[PDB]
């Protein structure tokens, strides 16, 4: 609402109230194409997420919890003296691509592209998403992964050579059997628009996740609360 920098003004702009969203993803893995929709709203102010998707194809062939990260970091809630470092807002309206390898331990692999952008008021995330070298057996496509997601800290560097960003991590899936399954993320993030951006220096996000179901929906769907928060300059 106040910030002496121009360019921190424009970007908190764009997200001072609540923002509709709406999420397209196609997928293919190992030749099971589906579709998924999502809608919902973010609130960067407090850094929450509440997001309803539904496969648009039938049953879902993955477990929903392997889509989490993939199904938009320009809602997380940057602290007012951290928000020079807030490279997803300060992409915006043009938007970003956000490209990610997900590497599922002793599995198969998703690879991800997707551009996040407004079209008018709503901020769009459209994705493609090919998975390959899955096992028939393994925890992915037997859906033997609990439904249910952990809090995970995620660190972000800038890439001042792509004018962006970069971050590799780690998600632990909970297996129905007590155990886990490791999920290998590989991140980058570029500007669609020629425009400057904001090229952070080196922070963290905390994510928090709840999913749930609609117990009046028939669809295979997912109901998704989130919230995410930037720490980790003093």
């Known amino acids: 609402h106040h910030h002496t920098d121009p360019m921190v003004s424009k970007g908190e702009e764009l997200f001072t109230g609540v923002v509709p969203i709406l999420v397209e993803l196609d997928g293919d893995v190992n030749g099971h194409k ?20 539904i496969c648009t194809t039938g049953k879902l062939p993955v477990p929903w ?16 003296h951290m928000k020079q470092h807030d490279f997803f807002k300060s992409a915006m309206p043009e938007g970003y691509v956000q490209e990610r390898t997900i590497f599922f331990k002793d599995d198969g692999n998703y690879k991800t592209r997707a551009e996040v952008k407004f079209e008018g008021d709503t901020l769009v995330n ?91 929906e028939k669809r295979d769907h997912m109901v998704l609360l989130e919230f995410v928060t930037a720490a980790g300059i003093t």
């Open 34 to 53: 589906f579709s998924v929709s999502g809608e919902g709203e973010g609130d960067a102010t407090y850094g929450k997420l509440t997001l309803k998707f």
């Open 126 to 216: 459209r994705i493609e998403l090919k998975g390959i070298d899955f096992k028939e057996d393994g925890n992915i496509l037997g859906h033997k992964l609990e439904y249910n997601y952990n809090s995970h800290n995620v660190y972000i560097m800038a890439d001042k050579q792509k004018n962006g960003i970069k971050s590799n991590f780690k998600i632990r899936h909970n297996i129905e059997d007590g155990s886990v399954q490791l999920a290998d993320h590989y991140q980058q993030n570029t500007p669609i628009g020629d425009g400057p951006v904001l090229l952070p220096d080196n922070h963290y996000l905390s994510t928090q996740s709840k999913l749930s179901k609609d117990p009046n």
């Open 65 to 80: 919890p392997t889509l989490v990260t993939t199904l938009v970091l320009c809602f997380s809630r940057y602290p007012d």
